[PDB]
Structures are given as C-alpha cells and as structure tokens.
Design a protein around this ligand. Sequence first.
Ligand SMILES: Cc1cccc(-c2ccc([C@@H]3[C@@H](CO)N4CCCCN(S(=O)(=O)c5nccn5C)C[C@@H]34)cc2)c1C
Ligand SMILES: Cc1cccc(-c2ccc([C@@H]3[C@@H](CO)N4CCCCN(S(=O)(=O)c5nccn5C)C[C@@H]34)cc2)c1C
Lengths: 959, 959
Amino acid sequence: NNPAIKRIGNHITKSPEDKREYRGLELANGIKVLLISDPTTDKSSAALDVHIGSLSDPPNIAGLSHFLQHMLFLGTKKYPKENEYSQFLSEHAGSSNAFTSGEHTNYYFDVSHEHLEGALDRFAQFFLSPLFDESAKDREVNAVDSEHEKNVMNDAWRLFQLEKATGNPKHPFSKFGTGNKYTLETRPNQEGIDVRQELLKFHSAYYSSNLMAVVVLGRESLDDLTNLVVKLFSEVENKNVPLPEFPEHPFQEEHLKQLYKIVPIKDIRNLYVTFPIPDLQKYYKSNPGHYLGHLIGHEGPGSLLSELKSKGWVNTLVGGQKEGARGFMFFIINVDLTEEGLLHVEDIILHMFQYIQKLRAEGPQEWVFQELKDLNAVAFRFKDKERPRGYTSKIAGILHYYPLEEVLTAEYLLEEFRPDLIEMVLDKLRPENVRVAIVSKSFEGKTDRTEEWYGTQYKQEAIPDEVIKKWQNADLNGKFKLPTKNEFIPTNFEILPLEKEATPYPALIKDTAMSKLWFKQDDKFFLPKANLNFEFFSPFAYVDPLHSNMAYLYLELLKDSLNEYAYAAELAGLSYDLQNTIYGMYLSVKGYNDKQPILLKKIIEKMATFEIDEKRFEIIKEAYMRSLNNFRAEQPHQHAMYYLRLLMTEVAWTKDELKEALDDVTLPRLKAFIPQLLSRLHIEALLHGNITKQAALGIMQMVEDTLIEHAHTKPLLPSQLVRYREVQLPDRGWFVYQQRNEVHNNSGIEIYYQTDMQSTSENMFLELFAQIISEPAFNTLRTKEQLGYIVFSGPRRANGIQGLRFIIQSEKPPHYLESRVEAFLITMEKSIEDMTEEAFQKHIQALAIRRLDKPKKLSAESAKYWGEIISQQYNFDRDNTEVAYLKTLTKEDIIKFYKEMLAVDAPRRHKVSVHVLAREMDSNPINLSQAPALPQPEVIQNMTEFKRGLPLFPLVKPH
Amino acid sequence: NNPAIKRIGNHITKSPEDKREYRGLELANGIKVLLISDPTTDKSSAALDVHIGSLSDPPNIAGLSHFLQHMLFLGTKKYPKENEYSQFLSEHAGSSNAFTSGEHTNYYFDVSHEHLEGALDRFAQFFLSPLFDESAKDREVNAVDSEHEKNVMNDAWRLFQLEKATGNPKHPFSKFGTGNKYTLETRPNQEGIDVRQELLKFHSAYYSSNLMAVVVLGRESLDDLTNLVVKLFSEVENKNVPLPEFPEHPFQEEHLKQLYKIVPIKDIRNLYVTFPIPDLQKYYKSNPGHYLGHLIGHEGPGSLLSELKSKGWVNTLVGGQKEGARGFMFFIINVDLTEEGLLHVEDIILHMFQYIQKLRAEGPQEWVFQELKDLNAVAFRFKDKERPRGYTSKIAGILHYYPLEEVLTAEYLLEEFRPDLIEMVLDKLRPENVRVAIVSKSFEGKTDRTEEWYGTQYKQEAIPDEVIKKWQNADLNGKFKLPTKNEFIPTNFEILPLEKEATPYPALIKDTAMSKLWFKQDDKFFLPKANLNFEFFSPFAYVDPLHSNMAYLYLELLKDSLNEYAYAAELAGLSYDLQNTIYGMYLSVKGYNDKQPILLKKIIEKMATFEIDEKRFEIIKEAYMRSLNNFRAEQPHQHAMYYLRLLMTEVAWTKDELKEALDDVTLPRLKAFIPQLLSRLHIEALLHGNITKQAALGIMQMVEDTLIEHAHTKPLLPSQLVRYREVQLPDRGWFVYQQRNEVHNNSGIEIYYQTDMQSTSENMFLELFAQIISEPAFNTLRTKEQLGYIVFSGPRRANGIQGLRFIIQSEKPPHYLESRVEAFLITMEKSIEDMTEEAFQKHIQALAIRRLDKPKKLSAESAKYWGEIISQQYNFDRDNTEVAYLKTLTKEDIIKFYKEMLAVDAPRRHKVSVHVLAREMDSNPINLSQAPALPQPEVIQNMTEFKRGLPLFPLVKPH
Ligand SMILES: Cc1cccc(-c2ccc([C@@H]3[C@@H](CO)N4CCCCN(S(=O)(=O)c5nccn5C)C[C@@H]34)cc2)c1C
Ligand SMILES: Cc1cccc(-c2ccc([C@@H]3[C@@H](CO)N4CCCCN(S(=O)(=O)c5nccn5C)C[C@@H]34)cc2)c1C
C-alpha cells in the first residue's frame, strides 16, 4: 500500500516499565529504521549508522573514513554554510557528534523537541550532497592531526595500534585509523592525489542506503515519525554494496606463542594475555564469550584474582571477549602487576591456565547460565530511561546485527544454553594459541623495535617451548573453586506506595549535631532502586599533606578488603562508591533497594572496625605513589585545569607536596590515623528512591549507631564545618602562572575571567553570555583558526564563585592563543550588537530549554539534589527560579555585563591565565581578526605568596 | 532625567557596515521617534508619518485625507506666508513632498545640513496650527482635480479603483481616495457641508500625537538632535485616537468565484487571479507570504512561468502577497496574455492550481527559507547608503509596526521558519476562493457595466461550477519542478586593498581602435560590489527604422532567452540591464563582484552565438507593435516632450515610422541583422567598484576576445563614430509644432529657449537662472494661477547643447499657457533687479550645495562618471570647476544673460514650442499679471522640412 516501505516490523519487545512507543521499518532503499515516540521528552534526537569504518580505508589514505566523518558537518548542497549544522543546533538547545570504529560510522544529534524536523533535514543532507569544500579540507585536517597528537603519548592508544601493527601486516586490522596531517595532506599531495575526489569517490561508493540504519526519537506520533523518515531518507541511493567481512584472522600461526616487552610512558606494570577466537556475535542468544569472561574475570571468593591477590602479585583482573571486525574476536586477561608480580609472570600465566583447566573439568554449569539469564532479565525490566542522544546512537549501531523486533532485547536477554559453544570457546584458550604482552618501565633501553605510528618502544621474543609445556600440563590448583550462588540477587521489587505527606523536593527530616538527613521518596520513575549518598565531614582528612594521603590510603585499603564480598552485590545491580574528599569522605550506594541496608552495614562496620594487612598496605602505598608521579603524563590542558584549581582555592595540596609526605606514612601512623579521623564527624546525607521516610531515618541512625559503638564518634561544632573560599582577584588585574609539560609536545592554556559570587542574577548573566559564544567560539578558534582539537568555553563554578573560562590545547605558544581568544572576544561584542532582537530571544529559549530538561533516571535527579547539598546552597527550585529571571534579560543587560566585567578594558576585569608549555617549547615571553593590545601581566612565581597577598571571597548564603 | 521622554531605545540594531548612529525615543505624547546622526551628510532631512489615510475619509467627502495633505503646505499660523515652506527649501537646496495611502499620511523634506532647525520648525508647524486658508482651498482643489484627471485615462488606476468598487460596497476599501472637484467642492457645496470645517474636524480628530512617527536625519549629535526633536514636537497634542482596523474582509462569499471582463484604454492583454487572505503583517518574522510569492513568481527552470511561456500563452508572471489595510491582504498572480493565451484563460488558470497542488504535496521546504534568510542577511549587511529624504520617509512609516530597536531590520531579516503558517496561506489559495479579471480590447462593446468614477467598461460573470471542479481536481503536472539551489549566491566578499597607482577619478587604461576603457577602483564605499558599464557602437543600430526595430528585437529576444538563467543572478544581488540606444547597445552589470564575470561571459557569448526561437520572435514582434501603438495613450506632457525630441535631434525615427516598417521585419532579415550589427563595433566601457586595474583589463579583454571569436568583430574608423547634432535655431525665431492627443482630454505644452553650446560659462548662467525661477515658476503657474497639476521648469541638455524649458499639462489651451509663461518671465525680470544682494548669494549657495552633494552609494557615483563618458565630454571634475565659477557670478551678469538670450525681445532669443491639444480641444490658434505681446510664429508643417531649413550645431570638444 506504500512503495517507499519494504516492510514494517511487528511488536518491538520492550521493557514492560518502558512508556515509550517503538516501530520498526525497512525503507525501500534497505535502510533499517527504528522510530521512538516519547511525548514526554524535552529534547528530540536522531542518529544514523553506516556499516563502514576504518577497515575499509584506502591503503594509501589511512584515516579517510574518520576524516570523512569530520567533513560531513562542514557543508551540504542545500545547506552550504560551513556551520549551519552546528549553528542551528546551538540555537535550538541541540548538540551533536560522531565516532568511527573499524566497521561503523555513527552520526547522532539531539535538539529541542519542537525542531526535530529542522535539524533532521539539515542532518539528513549529509548523505545526499556534501560539499567537501576544498577550503575546509585544508583546514579541518589540522583538527585531525591535533587529535592524533593528543593520542601519540597515550599508553592506551599506543597499545591499541601496537596490536594492529604486530599481527599480519596484510590484514586490514593493521590499518592506521585516526589519520594525521601526513597521511591526509602531506603524503597524498606528495603522491598527487586529489583528496576531495577520494572523499567523494569514497562517500559515493560506500555510503549506500543498504548499509545504513536510522533511529529517530521525538514527541511526534509514530505515524508522523514514519512519514518524516520516509520523506527525508527514501531519496538516499542504494548501491547494493556487499557488507565487508574478514574471515581470515589477523593473528596467524607465526603471530602465536609470541611475547612482547613494551616500554610505557606512564609508570605502570601490566600484563595482557590474548587468545584469538572466532566471531561469536551470531550466538547472541547463548552468549558463550560472557559466560567464560564471568568466571575468569570473577573477583569473588575462590576466584582467579583472589589467589593472585593473596600471593601479592596482582591487584586487578579483567577478562572476557574483545570485539573485532566481522569474522574474528579475541579473549583478553588483563592484570596489573605488583613489584613481585613482575618477576613471576611465568607463574601468573600458569595460575591462569590452572583456573581455566578447572573450568574444563567442571564443564558448563546450567545454574550459572540460569543466574546470568535471570540477572539480565531483571536489569532489562528495570532499565533506566536512556538519554535520547545516547539511546538513538546505540540502537542505530545494533540495527545491523539483530532483527527489528529483538533490537531492544538482543543485547540483554538470553535464551539458549549452549554447553557445546562454551566447550568450543574454552578449547581456544590454550597455551599453543596464546599471545603475551608485558608493559613495564623496566624494559627501558632493552628494546630493539619501534612502532612507526606512535613511537612505541618494544621487543619481540618467542615464548620458549619449555615454558609452553609447563602451561599446558596445568595441574589443578586447590585454591580455585567455582563461585557460589549470588546471595545479593534481589527478590523484592515492590514499589512502595507514595506517602501522603510526601514532597516534590528533598525534605530535611533530621538536623542533629551529628547528622543532617535529606529525604525524598521517588515520585517519577517507580523502579525498585534507591540512592544513598553520604558526606562525612572531618577536618583531619585534608589538614595537611600527610593526613590527605592517609585519608586516601585508609579508604583504598578498606575498599580492597571488601572487594571479594561486594563483587557479588555489584553484579546484582547494587554498587557502592567510596572515596576521600577535601572535607572528609564520600560514600554512595545505588541500585536495587532490596539488599541495600545489608551492604551499607557491612561498609560502615568495616569502616569503624578496620584491621590493616601490612602486606596490602605496602602494595597500595607504592601503587598510589606511581599514580601521583604518573600525573606528569596527563594532557597539558589538564595540567592547566589542575594548576588553576590550586591557585584559586584557599587550601589545596599539590601532587608534589603529597608525594613527598607519602614516605612518612608508616603503618603505625596510619593505624592511629583512622580512629582519629572517625572520632568526630558530621554526616550530611541524601536518601532518594523507592523507600519510605521511616526506613530512611533507620538507615541514617544505623550509620550513626554503628560509628558511635565501634569508633566512639562525637559530633562536630558548627564552627568547625568551614568550607574553603576562592581567591578574590583585584579589579583590572591579570596574573599568569607558567609551567611546562615534560611528556606531551602540545601546549595548553586555561583563561579564567572571574565574575562575582554566585547569585540568581550573576548566574544568568554568565550562563547566557556563555550560551551566545558557546558555538561561535568553537567555529572561530577551531573550525577557522584551527588552534587545536580541544577548544572549550563555558562557566567555571567553584567555592561559591564563578566566571568565564576558555581551555585550549594547541601546537602554538600560549601567549598566541591569549591574543586569539582575546581578539575573538571583540568579535562577539560586535556579533551581539548586530545580533537581531529575535536571534537573542532564541539563545534565551535555548538556555532555558537545556536548563529545564527533566532528568530521565533516578541517578540523574539525585545529582541535582546532591549538587545543591554539597554546595551548601540548597536551592532545589533553582531551575524554575533562574529560568524566570533569564527571560527578563535584554540585549543591553548583556552588553553592560561584557563591558563591565569582561571587555579588554573593563573596569572590573578579573583575569588569571595558566600557560602550560609543550615539552620542547622554548620559554615563551592577514586574514585573521584584530587582536587587542594587552597589559603587562603579573607572573605568579610562587602560589603560596600569591594567595597571601589577595583577599578571599565570602561564602554563599544558603537556602 | 527628562519628563518629556517616556523612554529611550537601547542600541538600535543596524547594518554592521553602516557608519550612521541611531537613537530611538518615545515622547510623552506617544510619538515614536528615530534619530539618525550622519556627520557626513551634505543634506539633512526629517519626515513624519500619521497612521491615517484614505480609508478614514468621511463617506460624504471622498479624498479629504489626500486633500488635507495638499493643504498643510499652503500656510501655517507661525509661518503664514502661503509658500514660506516651499520658498525656504528652495533657497536652501531643499525639497519636499508627501503621499497618502489607505492607512498613512507621509510628509518628508530634505535641506542643507546647516538649516535643519529652520526647516524642521516650519515643518513641525504643519501638525500644530495649519491655516487652511479659504482662498487657497478654492484654488488647490484644481490641483487635486488635475491629478485625478491625469489618472482617469490610466489603465492601472482604472483597475485599482475597479477592484475597490467590485467588493463589499459598505467596506471602506470601496471608498474613492484620490478625490476630485466633485467630491471636494461641487457635491459638498450642494449638501451644505463646509469643507474647511471638515478639514479641521479631521485634522483635529485624527492628527493625534499617538498616531505619529518622526525621523530626523542630520549632522548634529544624537543629543542635540534629541533636544531639537523634543523642543519642536513634544508640543503636539495627544488625543488618544484608537488605531483604526478593518477585520472584515472586503471580499465575502458572494464576491468569490466571479469573473470580470474589462476593456482597457491601451491595447493590453492581462489576467489577474486574486485570493483574499488574512492580515499576515503580524507573522512578519517568518513572512509566509513571500515564501509562496517566491516560489509562484519564480522565473527559473521548471517554474510556473516556464510552462505558461513554453506553451506561448504568457510572457511575464508576477506573484506574491498584495497589501491591504490592517486585517486583510490579497494574493495576486499577474500574467500578460499572448494572442493565444487570451483564448486559454481556463487552461492557464488550471496550470496555476496544478503548480499550487505541487507545493502542497511537497510541503514547505526549509532549505528554501534558509536560502531567503541567508540571502536577505547578506543584502542587509552590505546595504547601500540611502538618500536622506527616502530613508526618513520609509523608516517613519515602519515605526508604527515594529519596536524602536527592530525598525531597521524588521523589513529585511527573517528568523523563524513557520511551516504551519505556510500551509495556512497555501490553503487560502483555492478555486472556491478565487477572483478572476481579464483585460483585453476584445471585450469592446460586449460589456454591460460601467464604473462610476473612472468610467471603466466591464462585465461581471459567475465562474461556472463545472470550471471550479476541474480546477479543484488539479492533476499533478510533471512539467512543474521545484526550483534548485541558487548557484549565484556570492561567497567572496573580500574588499580588495586600494592599489598604489589608484586614482580618485576614472582613468583611461585602454585606448585601442576597438576599446576605450575607463577604470576607477572604489575608494569611498568599500562594499563587495562593482558596476560594469559598456557602450557598443555600431552605425547599423539606428541607420533606419527597419534596423532600429531589429536592434530592439535582437536584445529583447536575447534577454528572453537568458531570463531563466539570469533570474537566479538577480536574486543573488547580481542584475544586468541590456537595451539598444541610438548609437548601438548598452549593457550594464551591477551587484556583488564575486560571480560577476560568470554572468557577463554568458551574456556576451549569447550575443555572438544567438539562435532565435521562431515562436518567441512572432510573440515579441506583436507585443512590440502594441507598445508602439499604445504610446497614443500617454500623458499629453509626455507627447510634447517626445515631439520636441524629434524636432531638435539630427536623426530620429517617429513611433509611426517604426510601427509601419515593423511589418517588414521577417525572421530571416533579423537573423542576418545580428552578425552585421556585431561585425564592426567600438566599445567604450566604465569599470568601477571593488576590482583591481588588472582585473578590469581582464574584463575588457574577455568581452573583446569573445566578440572576435564568435562574431569576427572588427574595429570602426574614427570617422564612423559620428554623434548626432542639435538644430541651430535662428536668432529672434519662434517655431510651433501642433499635434493632438486622442486619449486624454488634457492639453500639454513644452517651451524650449535655446541658449548656446554647453560650456562652463554658459552652463552656470542657465543653471543659476533656472535656480532663481525654479520655485517662483511653480508658485506662480500652479500655486497661484492653477494651470494644472504638472508644471515643470528647468534646463534642457541634449547633444551638447542646452537651454531653458517649461512643461505644463493643463485643461486650458496651450497658446494661453504660452502667454502665462511669457507673463511670468517678465515678473522674474523685475524680481531679479529688485532681488537683494543677500537673497542672490543665497541662491548661489543653494545651487552650489546641490551640485557638490557627494554621492551616497556606488551606483550613483558611477552615473556621474558614466554621464561624462557617453556625453563625449570627460569632465570628471566638473562639479568643482563649475561651482568655483558659479560663485564669481553677479546679479548683473544674470540680467544681461536674460536680456540677450531669454527676454521676449532679446537679440538672440531661440524659441520653439510644442502644442499638444486635448482629445476634444477645438483646433487652437482679471487679477493676473500683464502678458507681453508675442510675434507671429512660424508653424511647423513637416518635421523634416523644419530640419532641412536650419543649420546644425557643432559637437562639444571633450576633456
Ligand atoms: C603486543 C600485544 C600482545 C597481546 C595483547 C596486546 C593488547 C591488546 C589489546 C589492548 C587494549 C588497549 C586498547 O585497545 N588497552 C587499554 C588498557 C586496558 C583495557 N582493555 S582490556 O582490559 O584488555 C578489555 N577491553 C575489552 C575487554 N577487555 C578485557 C583494552 C586494552 C592492549 C594490549 C598487545 C598490544
Ligand atoms: C476586478 C479584479 C479582480 C481581481 C484582481 C483585480 C486586480 C487588483 C489589483 C491589480 C493591480 C494593478 C494596479 O494596482 N496592477 C499593477 C501591475 C501588476 C502588479 N501587481 S502585483 O502583483 O500585486 C505587484 N506589483 C509589485 C509587487 N507586487 C506584489 C498589482 C496590479 C490588478 C488587478 C481586479 C481589478
């Protein structure tokens, strides 16, 4: 009855708690489409996936597909303005991005629900008539080269591409994917290639409709959505491109029984064991790869990790199948290495095969599969409502692998118990099929090979046959028992009835000298889940560097102890987060409310009654010091962000200060620290979810009663609950802090324009101005000036203060970017004066939409409340209140704000800049916009003297 | 603060290339004010708009609002001299006028920038205490009666007023607006009404301050202007008149599905299709009327016109929204009709609804709106600087509809794309809502109705139900495709830097036997625009009537061929004008310089490689013959000018001479004409704008190279470049040429006093004398003696000669008008001898101001240079040279000039008169001034014998 629709899918099985409406289609051109109607969503979204990726790149232009991704945004035949896509979405509360794997290219966006069509039309044109403007091609390649440069000194990227290079060099697996300036301009222009043809030749050849999948999520009806999708996409051309598949495995015989010794950039000690396996993707109903990954990577009692941990060799273990293109997969076992573990790699790998041998002798266990089936079934029934942008993007990728009807469930539910497949995969996990990778700084200078793309230093050795035989004849270790029935599986999913005296916002149901309990029973989602957030205040968690380290070590030791017990809970959708802060400790417990109080008690009991294993202490204390040193290898812009945090906070310890005081942390002092830390506390907590007021009060008092009994905890005085303040910069001032990054050869910079204390007025002034420049700053500093890959502009909130911040990571010196971002600021002044009165109210409505986006899941709503709480501001109706004021603003109110607080010659300009110089960058001192003349900056020489000479801002009045 | 200012507008968004400064005000009495400060302007200006017009006229005094317009100029209480307003502006390089629509009355003036205050004071008095002197009222009604009489025999006015009468007769839309002697004197004096009371009753009632808008433009600062404006206008009285609005549409049910067959005065064939629609004025941000008007009235490939054109039915199509008062609008589609098109009106209108149905099935196209929004955005950024008199009047009108800040942009920029509104208007365009009007002489005698005001003959028919159903069931025509992306949108707006060897005046950078290229790089405006003027000389373009006709047909056919191609360019701010002259062809290309060489090449290529469509040839050749016959229905004063042009030019072909020889133009002869016309040419060209010297040489060489390749063009001999001379009249001579106008019952006359060849001395003598008599000639012959509505006096320049000319259109016989202008000339003889030495030097400053007015936009500056070029005079510094001499003139030097060249008994009087008698005027032979005695005139019997018996003036020496 319609010629543009090949077929229509039947009922799409969804979670019975899912209110949304779904319809499956296959267009005439073979485009698999899923339509999602959610009349509640404040933002609509859509995404398209092409079953092509890096592996189909031409041999001579590595990275073309990932480059073509960048180039689809920069102009279409119908919408040729270079940034009409970015500009349209920014003005309509939208965002967008895209990624490129080996077999997929995935484009997605979201936007205000009233402009889905306007966005979709502009978005759809990507696959019909893209410009590939020569002017934009020569510019955007720098964004790709900067993107790669960031990754060049990253240990995870260097290993990623190392595995590719280490296998069969003829296999597309070895292809370089990211692409850089060499492979995309220098060498092609060196081989005479016109890249714009190779972009059009590729786009026209592979971007066929038969290899595309589309997901559209909007308020519109399912029928309205169907006509919209058919209207815009039925004109995509079908080329009947055969789906590429790679049956030959990238790792052949000569690539097996090999050992690699790799020099890392950070200070880490890791061991990777890999086995090639066939494409298990088609067995999704039985999922044998995850059955084995569950048992191998198990962290519970009697597990493989437990013994490697007990022997003081490893600390973490990760196992399971690793994805590869159609026709080949891998099986990885990842362990970090202690100092001793590095010397016993032979035994570690043996212990691995001893556990595998155990799994072979016991055979497939139906009860395990039944457990995994039941757990997934629950997780899917009570699946949290996904964000539209992430939801549409994920489904668009999996429409290629599963029938229309199962698309929602295919990745969750299990059906077939296939013990034959388990034994089949378990037989490929053998020493004659193994590949071993060791990463340790100890191989410095002992390497003889280099990886051409990232520079990785490594050495390749064949695994001695003598060692293989030891692994093959793997005796059974009596320390490896199969896991037992998970006792944390939830059984009570009953949604408690909504109390009469219930509230819409969290209520303060307890305000004692020791506790302060915020409570709200969930009235929006009705899932058997709850979030339990606790802030423990103790002035002894950050009083000096020595105590900060012990605060960290105290918890890292505590969590290490509970891992065996708690791992079962984690599997049962019941997790806990525990870590130190600058004000004390933070404990979060989210998941199914059934077994929740049982886990929380075991945590608080273990807190107050903790006994330290000396062997574990010395191992974590070491790993912690490497984690501090390894900060020198972070991105230059993260250095800038780190340093600025140090400069503007009243009290704050540098990594160097902590690292020095860490040697003085003897176990005696740590054993004495804990009881000192727990002796006086104040507890501010948020209990939010499927639980009643009375149960919530019981939770809080249980944490109190446990601490009082076993730690003899007393309350704090209200005068002790002092929050740290932010430094008050002087009017017309400009400070510059200069440091270097010894690792990365990129430069970084953060620029902080300090406004004033947070307030309903000063908040919206900033948030609106940052909305108007959000997009143009990206188009000017990256798309045009191509300063780098990382260009961020937005508000900075901290310690009750705020301001505008720019963050750039580039190849240029920072003092250049200073002028360029300063020159851009004057570009905005005009752009505002010329901005129409209507285009202005557009931005206001854009900010108001993003500010009033309703939280989709319980976890997200809790954050809003938890943010108002830790901030001591307690403004739970901030969104309605602040949006109301925002709409009353005029274009003139913004101009006076810029002229008064921000402009280069403003009277109240508060500017502080952080310059992070590239590794080899010498000590710093046309068709572009004019940069203003800048005053002489005051150069911070010492951070402590800097703060002593400046006032401190007050603290925000609460409520 | 200030109490006389209700509020002050913030930054008024302006074009970012606009140097002027703007401030918005709302006075206490509700007068919306815009202040324009332009310290560059040579002329200051101001204008006031009243939101009242013809529609608010009393039912018994049709035209009162348009009558009150004429009456405010004739005296004020503070300035009671009847012409103190007209006189003041004339003595200070000023001008003024005003018009009256259905909802507005708009007064405006300009004046020397040093006298804005003096003029504004006199101007403001219009709305405070006007005289309405009874003596002037009885006189000015003739000025209104003559204005209507002019329009009585005009086809556009007769249709205008016909539609009004054809709708609801109770609706103010049906009101007579222009007013004549009947509605303002004869009928009122018969019903006892005192018109002078109704003028004050109306003025006092409707001329309220709350319905006024004021714009003042001057060199003064925005504050000084603000003080001036408030001083003079804050004393206007606020009556709180409610703004009239007309929600009832003039066309109700009984007025729809009607057809009208109308007899025109000219021989024309037109078809008007109208649909009543609601007042779309409020949806101005999205403007759905222009989206549909854009697509319907589109002339590109696949458009409605192309198929109606291809079927040989129409030649032009016009579409869009037609303005009506608040609460109702119209939608018109205007197509001319070929001979065959006249017989296929049913099918033509069907083809109309077939196209509309196409627009409904494809629905609104957002990419189209984005093209219009981006195109308008460009045009506004690079907006040419407007003349003060026109700018203030246009802005004064739109201050009533938009906020103070948006006034400048409201009518240019678009923002919201509202497909819901587009579907709303597209639904009002349906056959059951249509009104059809056919205009053709073929309905002569077959009409049964007459329009009471203009006498229009028409017949009213109901559209048969059978025809309506056919139109409704409009199949989709495969010949109607949506327009495609406009490829002429400019992308390179780069302002080229000013070359070192640049000049202030056009330089002659090429002087060959074939070309002579004048060049100037724009050094004043710096917009991405350029003007390309070309004069092609061929002696075969005017050798005889047959060749003159083929010159016209050649270009009119060529433009017809290019229209489909060039229409896109027109939209992209890139237009071209092409037409024949008495020396050859003239091709002009103005607009954005980016895509300019692409269009110029396609024109010159099409010139030399032109192939004639036989069907189009016969259609234009017919339409061209009607255009010649239809000249008999032009204004009598236009006949007088036409005849005088024939008498005084060496060679000149009459309409009758061409029209008879037009039958002999067979297509073969035209095909042979073109290559002969192109075989030998001389090209004199002016390239001026945003372009370099070498780019200019590149432009010319392409025009040359293209002509040589495809037309084998050879140069002309210098002796072939013969210009036409003007007849040398004998001293003390007087000739009279008498003809009739068969259409209009008014008489016309031009009087030419020939002085001598143009020269810096003889030029300024005339230009000054015409300045002194400029105003008094209007005040004496119209304001006092009320000879008619059209009374013009000024210099006449032609073929290197000059002289003084009077032009009057009256009801009186011409030979009477002859004496009156002679009687006025003696009035001036006295007025000069008695004129003060101060009043004399005032006129000198008046002429000097107007001569030295700097051009505001590029198009205007090119004209000044282009005039010097075609005139073979090449005096680019004429204004400074002539004004310098002008100041050295004395009152005595003028008197001797009059006694010698102009006076009735001067020794060198050279007088020639043209008498055009009204249709029914018999063959022509108090308190007023004494008319002098005139000699016996020599009566021109044949124009050729006239020229044969007289010498010919030389030609002006250049440089
Ligand atoms: C020379 C050689 C021999 C044998 C194996 C390897 C090898 C293979 C893959 C990796 C990937 C690389 C990014 O692709 N890394 C990031 C750090 C650890 C996280 N994970 S993961 O834990 O392995 C992993 N992801 C999915 C499942 N699981 C278990 C990815 C690992 C690293 C090293 C090499 C390089
Ligand atoms: C009895 C009857 C029924 C239906 C319609 C009409 C009717 C109404 C108005 C007109 C006017 C007439 C003089 O006012 N013309 C000028 C030539 C064609 C141009 N246009 S225009 O398209 O609106 C138009 N020019 C410029 C922009 N735009 C939108 C007006 C048309 C002509 C005919 C009548 C008289």
